Amino acid sequence: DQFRAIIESPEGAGHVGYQYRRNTGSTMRMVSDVLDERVSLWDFHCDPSGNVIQPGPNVDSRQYLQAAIDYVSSNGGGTITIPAGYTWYLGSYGVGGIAGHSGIIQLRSNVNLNIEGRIHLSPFFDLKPFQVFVGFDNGDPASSGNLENCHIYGHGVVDFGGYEFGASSQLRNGVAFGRSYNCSVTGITFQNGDVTWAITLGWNGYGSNCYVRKCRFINLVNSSVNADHSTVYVNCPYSGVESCYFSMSSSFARNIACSVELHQHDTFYRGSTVNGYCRGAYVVMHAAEAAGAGSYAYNMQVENNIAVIYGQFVILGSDVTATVSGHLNDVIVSGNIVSIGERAAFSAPFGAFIDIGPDNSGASNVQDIQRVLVTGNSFYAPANITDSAAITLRANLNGCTFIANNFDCRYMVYNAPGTTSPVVQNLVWDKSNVIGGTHANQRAGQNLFDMQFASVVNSTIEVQLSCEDLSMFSCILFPASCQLSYSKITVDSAWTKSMSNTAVFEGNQQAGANVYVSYPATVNLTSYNTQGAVPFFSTDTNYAWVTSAYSLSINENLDFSPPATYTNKANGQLVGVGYNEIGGVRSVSVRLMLQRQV
Amino acid sequence: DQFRAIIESPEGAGHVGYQYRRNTGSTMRMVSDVLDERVSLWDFHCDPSGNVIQPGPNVDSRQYLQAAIDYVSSNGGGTITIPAGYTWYLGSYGVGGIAGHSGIIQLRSNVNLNIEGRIHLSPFFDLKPFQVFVGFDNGDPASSGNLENCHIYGHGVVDFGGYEFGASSQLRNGVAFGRSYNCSVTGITFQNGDVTWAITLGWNGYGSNCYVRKCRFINLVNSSVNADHSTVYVNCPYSGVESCYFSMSSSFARNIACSVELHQHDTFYRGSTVNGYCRGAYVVMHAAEAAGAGSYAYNMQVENNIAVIYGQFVILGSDVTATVSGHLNDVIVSGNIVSIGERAAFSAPFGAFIDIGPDNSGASNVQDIQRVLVTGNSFYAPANITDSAAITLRANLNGCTFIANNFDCRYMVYNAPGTTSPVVQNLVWDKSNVIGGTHANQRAGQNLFDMQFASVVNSTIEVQLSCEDLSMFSCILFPASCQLSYSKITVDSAWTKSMSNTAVFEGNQQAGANVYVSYPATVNLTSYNTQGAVPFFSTDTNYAWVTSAYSLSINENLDFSPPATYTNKANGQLVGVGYNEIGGVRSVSVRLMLQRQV
Amino acid sequence: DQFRAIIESPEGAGHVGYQYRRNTGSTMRMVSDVLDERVSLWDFHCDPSGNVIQPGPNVDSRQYLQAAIDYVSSNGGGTITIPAGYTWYLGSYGVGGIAGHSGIIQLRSNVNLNIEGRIHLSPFFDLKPFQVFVGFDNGDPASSGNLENCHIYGHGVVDFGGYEFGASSQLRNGVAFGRSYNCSVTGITFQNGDVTWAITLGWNGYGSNCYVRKCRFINLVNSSVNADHSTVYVNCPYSGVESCYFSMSSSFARNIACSVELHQHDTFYRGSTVNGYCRGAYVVMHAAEAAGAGSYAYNMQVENNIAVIYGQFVILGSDVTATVSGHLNDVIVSGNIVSIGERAAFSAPFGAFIDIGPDNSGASNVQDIQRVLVTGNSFYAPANITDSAAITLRANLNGCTFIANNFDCRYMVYNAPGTTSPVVQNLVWDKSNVIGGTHANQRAGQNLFDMQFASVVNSTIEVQLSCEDLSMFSCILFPASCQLSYSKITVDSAWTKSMSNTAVFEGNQQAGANVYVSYPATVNLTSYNTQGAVPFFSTDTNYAWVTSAYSLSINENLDFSPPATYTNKANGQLVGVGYNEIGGVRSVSVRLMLQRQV
Ligand SMILES: CC(=O)N[C@@H]1[C@@H](O[C@H]2O[C@H](CO)[C@H](O[C@H]3O[C@H](CO[C@@H]4O[C@@H](C)[C@H](O)[C@@H](O)[C@H]4O)[C@@H](O)[C@H](O)[C@H]3O)[C@H](O[C@@H]3O[C@H](CO)[C@@H](O)[C@H](O)[C@H]3NC(C)=O)[C@H]2O)[C@H](O)[C@@H](CO[C@H]2O[C@H](CO)[C@@H](O)[C@H](O)[C@H]2O)O[C@H]1O
Ligand SMILES: CC(=O)N[C@@H]1[C@@H](O[C@H]2O[C@H](CO)[C@H](O[C@H]3O[C@H](CO[C@@H]4O[C@@H](C)[C@H](O)[C@@H](O)[C@H]4O)[C@@H](O)[C@H](O)[C@H]3O)[C@H](O[C@@H]3O[C@H](CO)[C@@H](O)[C@H](O)[C@H]3NC(C)=O)[C@H]2O)[C@H](O)[C@@H](CO[C@H]2O[C@H](CO)[C@@H](O)[C@H](O)[C@H]2O)O[C@H]1O
Ligand SMILES: CC(=O)N[C@@H]1[C@@H](O[C@H]2O[C@H](CO)[C@H](O[C@H]3O[C@H](CO[C@@H]4O[C@@H](C)[C@H](O)[C@@H](O)[C@H]4O)[C@@H](O)[C@H](O)[C@H]3O)[C@H](O[C@@H]3O[C@H](CO)[C@@H](O)[C@H](O)[C@H]3NC(C)=O)[C@H]2O)[C@H](O)[C@@H](CO[C@H]2O[C@H](CO)[C@@H](O)[C@H](O)[C@H]2O)O[C@H]1O
Ligand SMILES: [Ca+2]
Ligand SMILES: [Ca+2]
Ligand SMILES: [Ca+2]
Ligand SMILES: [Cl-]
Ligand SMILES: [Cl-]
Ligand SMILES: [Cl-]
Ligand SMILES: [K+]
Ligand SMILES: [K+]
Ligand SMILES: [K+]
């Protein structure tokens, strides 16, 4: 039987005709043509004689997957399915352009991977570096071509085999898309590793329209050797992370792991849930990464995320090289609900909703960060966590605006004394920020706003309490070493009646010509003896800066009343006109709202 | 012809060789192997002799779909397509573990359903309970195994056949995922029923990473027999509902139907549109559901939804059992635009943006709700709807914060007199909340903020009007039965000049040592006869609590001026110093801002 | 060989049996039956003898794609794949119902297109109108049937061939879904054209549940002939655009192109990124489009978008026909970060975050726009861009509310003098709006809030600066031609000490009985000679409207103090009581906060 021989051969399907639903108007095809409309790893997972090899822990699937990608790339692209119901193990490094990236598989343009099954790293990779999927085509990324139109999706899994790092200097990654344009990962679970990143998008600003959506990242740090981790690093513009889940269980992750980093303009991190990490997101312009999309990171969005972290939620920064200065501006952080998970004070990096972070060498004077809006977020830290702040302002800041947040933590504004001395401009804390009471009674010796800066200019701090905290030393304190000019500092009187210090200016900075301030204080006054309208004067001469003051106290007396309002005198006394129904020197201790130019 | 017999047999495709695109480097396969890469209901929808059965209203497809799921489960999973262009009817109950859940189909781990066609319930199910897809494997959920990695997706439809409930005690569901980990429904339309739920995720905190996305839910309540309905019930952590559409047309739905419920930590409801429902979302910690994820519901997010409802948008609650106390905290409700649809006053449950709801037995003293942020929402109710409030505060509340919302309805804060007497702590209504004017002139006999509580502590109400409503009895009223301490209550003067009552304290609660208050009032004053600086005193003695007051009125006179500011006296009179250019007793009725400790 | 002849025929696959994975419990099928579970363009892309035709620039694929759609429609629907690895060119118009829409392909209900390859317009379409995919079935949309359940998705591309418009009156579109119910486009890149729209949803309110998700729109305007462009036009309710990318590079786009328009109730535009466009979104109710969903556009959401534009971000409007009045209400604009891209002043349409736009004939008195909430957005325009405003209020407005935004541009509120004279009601600018300083020192001769209106009622403007701008003429100015009543206008004193004009009322409008105002001013005062309590009077008589004033200045003198507070007198002088320790006439120039009814 000649026909038998043909039909049973690999050419057989090319001899069996087919026409869609027996439609006389349809194309006369061969079965092979229709089968050729799809492709899977099974079509390349064979020995040199063409016999299928079953996958398993004792088989290295790398060369077969690479053969599939290379072939489909040759025919103008398509989608290769990694079949469900099997685990496909990888057990060797790739060659050529990806060798410079410890690469296993080389991605190619217009070739998508539909991962429905599981991909698992074999013990070959224990204690070694690896980047599982690499879209660079040269070991030097500067000399690499682009990866375009490459999408990885499905219900499958990338499993890093649990192996610890061999050395802190090693790098490990899941997907490095490279100089990547229109690439994405959707639906995939990345799990069980000790890695630097799960996914990186772009290279130093080269790339566009790269997205990570509906992915899970689970337990991707597990050792003390791991130097640092960010799950997704976004290093091209017009790119981002949406609707993902990030979880860690290791103690190490609570000290080293961040969920996302946004490093180029028009990038976003939205609608995701994070548990067990140190940090939520870095939002930065590194001068060293400015080649592809310029030296400005603008239009940066962190919105509608949910997080339990141990360190800082959003870290802002920018820095310089010999030839480039990085700028960060036009940032929005909104709709996020974030807490510091239960932990001892000082047992992880300092807790913060916003951190203004010094550069990688510790420099606090290279930053150009401005036009940042932080609005409609909620932040909570347990009462014991001394090291918790709405903002840790540790490096130069050229602007940040807080409106309509709920912050419930130890400090509102903080920087550690005897560390950096930031120059602060255009810091706005609107009165609409609600200050919670979880840390009430825990603030002995502490200043709610602790202004440990070199200087503050064109700034607004409108303090509004919503309950007592009579433990705090002050609502806001400026050390004598902090210059203050062209600024507005106010403390609302509600819940403050029993505080000896509301606002403290240790260098008398509130006396500046262009400082606008109001806060409560207790003042002792004595009157003249005159019957009728009579002056009251303050005993102390500490009020040369006061433009007006008014009573926050009732008058318990019948035969006289102190002034409702006061001005000052050249010698620093307050003075006002009260009323003596009967004559007599009067003496009273009253709570006043002290006002300067407001 | 022996070969003929083989080829035409069910083994035939196993004798036809194939090699992808005639690539010599590809696997030598058989056609059957490639066809085996997919699977559909057609592969199991056959009689006991293997002959295909066409689906239709007179065929029960249940056993065939179950056979497909069971088989694919056996081979490590995959995705079964329910083909487009056909309606597949279900006409009997399933057996075994799902019998305890009125189950039709049993879902199995790692077996996905790609529903491209229609699934329709046959009249067998009329007046009966049913749960169409069940992931429990035991009638007792406590004894059930887990369902993992089960995804239902496609462009198809689940049609509940229109059948009314037979009895109010019956339950009906579309998908019960069970103790569910990494399960999801995407793209599916659920329609034409009278059901309890369309989808439930998790069981009493057991489960994770379950999501409902891009689904439609249309007309799923149609009878008076239906006891209660919530379209999606989220009962496992790290789970949620995103970008869905919910519509009802029945009158019954306007009284009984809610779109989503969030019952465990780290859950979300975002970006969805609701029409025709009673309620938007319950956000609750039931102690009885605390087994799998603990007794705290935290990190609860309701954001960027669009709704026309007839009752309450978000209902908050928590409750207790003999052995567990439920807590609800760290909630954010933001970016939502919501209205009460046109209806008569009191014709549906009381309209509210936020409701603090008593437990299922009516208890108002079992709740532990705090750290809730409601910000950047818009709420509207038509002018006739008396029963509309920004918040109906009906049970104990340990904290809720309102910032930067626009509320345009009858009441801002309300609880019905002669009902519950909530203990309220840490209620914050920031001045940035804009109060609309749709209900201006409709508020005769009514208090905008009607503080019908047992007690209020550590609370802030900053009332700002944006137009007149001279019909209202008061801006805020505290009955004598409401204790008030350590709180800030302010009424801005804008649009209030003609109001006889701005703030009303029926038990003189504003006199408390730690109550901080300011509001306008009209006061009559008379002066002494003295030429020059002269005292003015109030006729009435109702101001022992006032620390300062200032004029909100012009002075129409030429020969004297009343005081700009006043303090008080021990007998409760106000006193201030004005000026008599000419001597004479003066008498004036002036509008004052009365201030206490602010 | 008879069998040979059969097997090699188009009936051959119908003679090769198959049974899934050799399962004895599975259906005995033929290979043809399984192949029939999918369908692609290859099944119809053949000559009249059934021989396949390869696609290419010299082949018109139109009739073959139409044949596929028509056939699948006949069998109750399904999904047709447009295969990857090929470009499929379109080179002629379609016939019948779509001819009235310059249609190429007619979409049919329940027939989806999985576009994995590229679709490209041939030069036939140069200088001509075209709508590539049309879901109308009649040239007159009023007589058209509905398109239902039609989804276009995949990783492919629709390429418009780069051809310029032939005439401004022509229309070009990518997908017109028609009277469209449950239709969507997901994942597709639309590029390289000169078109009116890429996608339109619905027709004059007819349609529902239509969505555009994860699409890219790149370079879709390229000529001066193009009259106007909006990328996605949403003209049915319960529909919207989510997570899309929009980019233009042409100069023309910066003057004519808008990314999205929302024209019916319950529509949304979220989570998208825009670069190179004139405008972000129109949100409008055109009376002429009111047939299918009524004359109210309500529940309109513009959230969490990222944009660099050259004109206006959100344009609001409504208008009338002979028989219908359009209303726009219940709008939310939040979470957006938007800037005007670098450009010269007046080189593109006037820059604005919100524009209240006159109708297409220029009418400013047909609008009914109200209950709009603009909250938690950030807007920036470079310092040189004179024509930049938070809101350009150019037509009648019945309400708009601004809370907790950061606006950094030339004007906050603006309308050009000598143009329209809007009637403004219920405009609310909350104090929580942060006014940036990029345009500080650029505002010579300009008013920050320039109230160029016919009238303002029931409005709130609470101006809060966050730095000096001593160049501006005033913070807020009302021309004499603007009536002002029942409104609250306040200027906070911070950073204003050196301004000669803070608030300017050119028709003395602040004197109205129901106008509530406070702002700083410098006043000269002189006292009587009396030792002791002594009156000070203003030199000028411009203060008949002032209810109280207080000092914003220190007192540099030792022997006297001026009053802390003042009232007025019938002749318009201010008067207050100070203190002369020694007798003598005193004369001082002081900075006062002037207050009226607040
Ligand atoms: C883990 C992480 O993301 N950490 C960031 C930190 O990023 C920097 O350190 C990282 C440590 O892993 C990365 O440096 C390592 O990798 C570099 C890149 O690898 C080479 O190039 C790639 C293409 C190739 O495949 C590899 O084989 C290597 O040849 C190495 O050059 C370097 O020596 C390693 O230490 C990270 O490098 C970036 O990695 C991305 C993603 O792979 C690439 O696209 C970039 O090209 C590459 N960039 C550079 C300059 O090398 C390092 O950038 C971040 O710096 C900090 C940010 O926070 C600090 O800075 C801000 C701004 O001043 C302050 O505000 C903060 O206070 C301060 O903490 O965040 C960490 O989470
Ligand atoms: C319809 C709905 O969601 N209504 C909620 C209401 O939920 C409670 O009543 C529901 C009525 O249908 C459910 O109770 C019925 O179902 C229970 C569960 O079924 C059994 O178990 C399942 C697994 C099995 O398949 C079935 O065969 C049954 O054996 C029955 O036990 C009960 O007897 C029925 O009445 C709902 O039960 C939950 O259902 C989910 C989803 O199926 C399961 O995952 C849970 O295990 C199950 N939980 C329990 C405890 O049974 C009932 O919870 C909500 O209670 C209210 C919430 O609002 C009220 O409480 C809050 C907090 O105190 C207050 O703030 C509010 O003011 C107050 O109104 O919301 C309704 O919409
Ligand atoms: C390009 C764009 O979207 N521009 C809008 C502008 O829309 C109007 O002009 C458009 C110009 O292209 C459209 O008018 C053209 O098309 C019409 C519709 O085509 C016919 O019908 C379709 C079904 C058929 O396939 C075609 O063959 C035609 O027969 C023509 O009738 C008209 O003559 C053309 O100029 C647009 O028409 C709408 O198009 C959508 C989408 O296709 C259809 O669903 C509608 O039925 C159709 N509607 C009408 C009434 O024709 C025109 O609406 C917008 O008007 C403005 C909105 O902004 C202006 O108005 C508001 C509110 O008053 C103010 O606030 C603003 O200040 C002011 O600028 O926005 C532009 O971007
Ligand atoms: Ca390297
Ligand atoms: Ca049961
Ligand atoms: Ca036409
Ligand atoms: Cl200064
Ligand atoms: Cl008290
Ligand atoms: Cl008036
Ligand atoms: K490497
Ligand atoms: K049941
Ligand atoms: K046309």
Side-chain angles (χ1 to χ4, degrees), chain A residues 2 15 36 46 61 87 92 96 145 204 215 294 338 386 396 416 434 437 441 506 550 571 584:
Chain A
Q2 176 192 318
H15 295 272
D36 285 345
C46 58
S61 293
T87 303
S92 56
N204 294 358
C215 289
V338 178
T386 305
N396 284 2
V434 176
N441 304 303
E506 291 185 340
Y550 66 92
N571 67 350

Side-chain angles (χ1 to χ4, degrees), chain A residues 2-3 6-7 15-31 34-35 37 75-79 86 110 112 149 151 153 181-182 184 186 208-209 211 213-214 238 242 266-268 270 298-301 303-304 330-332 334 371-373 375 401-404 426 428 430 432 458-460 462 485-488 513-514 516 528 530 533-535 537 544-549 565-571 575-577 595-598, chain C residues 3-4 7-14 16 21 31-33 35-46 49-52 71-72 75 83-86 116 118 155 189 214 216 218 242-243 245 271-275 304-308 335-339 376-378 380 404-406 408 431-434 438 464-468 492-498 533 550-565 577-579 581 593:
Chain A
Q2 176 192 318
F3 191 55
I6 295 160
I7 292 296
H15 295 272
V16 181
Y18 166 77
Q19 190 170 48
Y20 180 70
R21 300 195 71 170
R22 290 193 295 175
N23 177 33
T24 55
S26 281
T27 308
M28 296 187 299
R29 310 181 71 185
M30 296 294 136
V31 168
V34 192
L35 299 177
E37 289 186 0
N75 298 340
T79 300
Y86 302 88
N110 305 297
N112 305 317
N149 308 320
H151 307 283
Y153 70 95
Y181 302 80
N182 193 37
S184 67
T186 307
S208 196
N209 302 143
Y211 310 104
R213 297 193 192 94
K214 300 189 297 187
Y238 308 115
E242 183 161 27
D266 293 280
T267 56
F268 61 85
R270 303 192 294 251
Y298 59 92
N299 278 354
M300 316 296 282
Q301 181 196 73
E303 290 181 334
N304 300 344
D330 309 300
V331 180
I332 189 162
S334 65
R371 308 201 295 271
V372 180
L373 177 58
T375 189
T401 303
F402 292 89
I403 325 172
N426 308 306
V428 173
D430 190 68
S432 65
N458 286 322
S459 297
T460 297
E462 299 182 297
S485 65
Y486 291 90
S487 293
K488 176 188 186 180
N514 299 285
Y516 299 82
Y528 284 171
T530 317
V534 61
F537 304 89
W545 55 274
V546 173
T547 59
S548 77
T565 67
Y566 302 80
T567 49
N568 71 345
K569 276 177 55 152
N571 67 350
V575 56
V577 180
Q595 304 188 304
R596 170 170 182 75
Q597 308 192 95
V598 302
Chain C
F3 191 55
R4 199 200 230 281
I7 292 296
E8 293 196 319
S9 74
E11 273 85 38
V16 181
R21 300 195 71 170
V31 168
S32 59
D33 301 318
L35 299 177
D36 285 345
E37 289 186 0
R38 51 84 271 157
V39 65
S40 76
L41 192 42
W42 289 126
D43 293 296
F44 296 84
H45 206 270
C46 58
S49 300
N51 301 308
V52 70
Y71 188 89
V72 173
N75 298 340
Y86 302 88
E116 296 297 341
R118 297 181 184 161
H155 304 102
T189 296
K214 300 189 297 187
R216 303 192 297 165
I218 302 169
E242 183 161 27
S243 300
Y245 171 75
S272 301
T273 297
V274 175
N275 185 210
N304 300 344
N305 305 295
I306 300 174
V308 177
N336 304 281
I337 188 144
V338 178
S339 55
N377 305 282
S378 191
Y380 167 76
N405 302 282
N406 199 172
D408 193 9
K431 204 169 188 162
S432 65
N433 292 290
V434 176
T438 294
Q464 179 66 67
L465 306 187
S466 48
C467 65
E468 289 190 330
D492 190 81
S493 70
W495 293 278
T496 73
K497 76 181 288 189
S498 300
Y550 66 92
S551 179
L552 303 173
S553 291
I554 59 157
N555 174 33
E556 71 184 348
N557 302 290
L558 261 177
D559 293 353
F560 77 99
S561 57
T565 67
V577 180
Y579 194 72
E581 293 188 32
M593 179 64 80

Side-chain angles (χ1 to χ4, degrees), chain A residues 472-496:
Chain A
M472 78 180 83
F473 183 71
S474 69
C475 296
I476 181 163
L477 183 143
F478 290 89
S481 57
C482 185
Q483 294 176 307
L484 179 65
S485 65
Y486 291 90
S487 293
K488 176 188 186 180
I489 308 291
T490 65
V491 180
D492 190 81
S493 70
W495 293 278
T496 73

Side-chain angles (χ1 to χ4, degrees), chain B residues 484-487 512-515:
Chain B
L484 179 65
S485 65
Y486 291 90
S487 293
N514 299 285
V515 180

Side-chain angles (χ1 to χ4, degrees), chain C residues 374-450:
Chain C
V374 182
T375 189
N377 305 282
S378 191
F379 183 58
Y380 167 76
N384 68 292
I385 304 184
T386 305
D387 54 318
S388 59
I391 180 173
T392 52
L393 202 174
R394 303 187 299 124
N396 284 2
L397 180 63
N398 295 329
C400 190
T401 303
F402 292 89
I403 325 172
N405 302 282
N406 199 172
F407 291 120
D408 193 9
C409 54
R410 187 58 65 88
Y411 290 102
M412 293 302 107
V413 174
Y414 187 75
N415 187 44
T419 65
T420 59
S421 290
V423 178
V424 178
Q425 326 190 67
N426 308 306
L427 173 64
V428 173
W429 184 285
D430 190 68
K431 204 169 188 162
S432 65
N433 292 290
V434 176
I435 299 170
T438 294
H439 290 246
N441 304 303
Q442 311 302 327
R443 299 196 174 93
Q446 303 178 309
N447 308 123
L448 181 66
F449 291 78
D450 202 350

Side-chain angles (χ1 to χ4, degrees), chain B residues 3-4 7-14 16 21 31-32 35-36 38-46 49-52 71-72 75 84-85 116 118 155 189 214 216 218 242-243 245 271-275 304-308 335-339 376-378 380 404-406 408 431-434 438 464-468 492-498 533 550-558 560-565 577-579 581 593, chain C residues 2-3 6-7 15-23 25-31 34-35 37 75-79 86 110 112 149 151 153 181-182 186 208-209 211 213-214 238 242 266-268 270 298-301 303-304 330-332 334 371-373 375 401-404 426 428 430 432 458-460 462 486-488 513-514 516 528 530 533-535 537 544-549 565-571 575 577 595-598:
Chain B
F3 191 55
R4 199 200 230 281
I7 292 296
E8 293 196 319
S9 74
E11 273 85 38
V16 181
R21 300 195 71 170
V31 168
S32 59
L35 299 177
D36 285 345
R38 51 84 271 157
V39 65
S40 76
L41 192 42
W42 289 126
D43 293 296
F44 296 84
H45 206 270
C46 58
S49 300
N51 301 308
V52 70
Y71 188 89
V72 173
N75 298 340
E116 296 297 341
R118 297 181 184 161
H155 304 102
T189 296
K214 300 189 297 187
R216 303 192 297 165
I218 302 169
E242 183 161 27
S243 300
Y245 171 75
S272 301
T273 297
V274 175
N275 185 210
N304 300 344
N305 305 295
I306 300 174
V308 177
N336 304 281
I337 188 144
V338 178
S339 55
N377 305 282
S378 191
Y380 167 76
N405 302 282
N406 199 172
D408 193 9
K431 204 169 188 162
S432 65
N433 292 290
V434 176
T438 294
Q464 179 66 67
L465 306 187
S466 48
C467 65
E468 289 190 330
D492 190 81
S493 70
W495 293 278
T496 73
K497 76 181 288 189
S498 300
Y550 66 92
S551 179
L552 303 173
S553 291
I554 59 157
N555 174 33
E556 71 184 348
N557 302 290
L558 261 177
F560 77 99
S561 57
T565 67
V577 180
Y579 194 72
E581 293 188 32
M593 179 64 80
Chain C
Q2 176 192 318
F3 191 55
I6 295 160
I7 292 296
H15 295 272
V16 181
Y18 166 77
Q19 190 170 48
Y20 180 70
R21 300 195 71 170
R22 290 193 295 175
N23 177 33
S26 281
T27 308
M28 296 187 299
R29 310 181 71 185
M30 296 294 136
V31 168
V34 192
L35 299 177
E37 289 186 0
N75 298 340
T79 300
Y86 302 88
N110 305 297
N112 305 317
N149 308 320
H151 307 283
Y153 70 95
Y181 302 80
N182 193 37
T186 307
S208 196
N209 302 143
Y211 310 104
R213 297 193 192 94
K214 300 189 297 187
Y238 308 115
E242 183 161 27
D266 293 280
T267 56
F268 61 85
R270 303 192 294 251
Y298 59 92
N299 278 354
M300 316 296 282
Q301 181 196 73
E303 290 181 334
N304 300 344
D330 309 300
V331 180
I332 189 162
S334 65
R371 308 201 295 271
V372 180
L373 177 58
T375 189
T401 303
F402 292 89
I403 325 172
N426 308 306
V428 173
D430 190 68
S432 65
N458 286 322
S459 297
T460 297
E462 299 182 297
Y486 291 90
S487 293
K488 176 188 186 180
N514 299 285
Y516 299 82
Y528 284 171
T530 317
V534 61
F537 304 89
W545 55 274
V546 173
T547 59
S548 77
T565 67
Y566 302 80
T567 49
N568 71 345
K569 276 177 55 152
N571 67 350
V575 56
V577 180
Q595 304 188 304
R596 170 170 182 75
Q597 308 192 95
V598 302

Side-chain angles (χ1 to χ4, degrees), chain B residues 100-102 131 134 136 139 141 169-171 173 176 196-197 200-204 227-231 233 235 256 258 261 263 279 282-286 288-289 315-319 355-360 363 366-367 369 394:
Chain B
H101 309 276
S102 307
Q131 300 193 51
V134 174
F136 294 112
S169 62
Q170 296 174 335
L171 299 171
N173 200 2
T196 310
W197 312 283
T200 63
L201 312 177
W203 176 73
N204 294 358
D228 203 3
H229 174 100
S230 291
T231 309
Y233 195 115
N235 208 10
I256 73 157
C258 187
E261 306 206 7
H263 282 241
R279 298 168 183 108
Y282 285 83
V283 179
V284 169
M285 192 65 223
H286 280 318
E289 297 180 325
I315 306 86
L316 304 176
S318 82
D319 53 47
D355 178 43
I356 310 305
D359 79 4
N360 280 318
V366 298
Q367 290 75 19
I369 303 158
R394 303 187 299 124

